[PDB]
């Protein structure tokens, strides 16, 4: 049969440290 | 039918506070 | 077909400024 719909969204890791 | 495509990409949290 | 698998993981933004 035809392919199913897309899956759900994949969060990334924390951002880098802030500036001084 | 076959599975659908992978879903969209998942940002992570803000990074930690900066230093003095 | 069934729904696709999840997308890949999403870095977050830079953290907050440190003390002055």
Q: Which of B1, B8, B18 sits opposite A9 (nearest CB)?
A: B8
Report which DSSP code applies to C4: P
Q: CA nearest B16: which of A13, A11, C10, C16?
A: C16
Residue B13 and residue A17: Cα distance in Å, rounded? 11
Specify the resolution in Å. 1.1
* Triad A7, A12, A14: Cα angle to 5°: 160
Residue A3 and residue C13: Cα distance in Å, rounded? 36
Q: Cα dist. C20→A8, B17, B20, C16 in Å?
A: 42, 12, 6, 12
Residue B17 and residue B12: Cα distance in Å, rounded? 15
Handedness of CA A15, C14, B17, A20 (dihedral sign): positive
**Experiment used for this model:** X-ray
Nearest CA in chain A to C1: A4
- Asked whether the beta carbons of C15 and A16 are under 8 A apart, the reply is yes
Q: Do C4 and B1 touch (CB under 8 A)?
A: no
Residue B14 and residue C9: Cα distance in Å, rounded? 15
């Amino acid at each position: 049969g035809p392919p199913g719909p897309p899956g759900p969204p994949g969060p990334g890791p924390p951002g880098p440290p802030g500036p001084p």
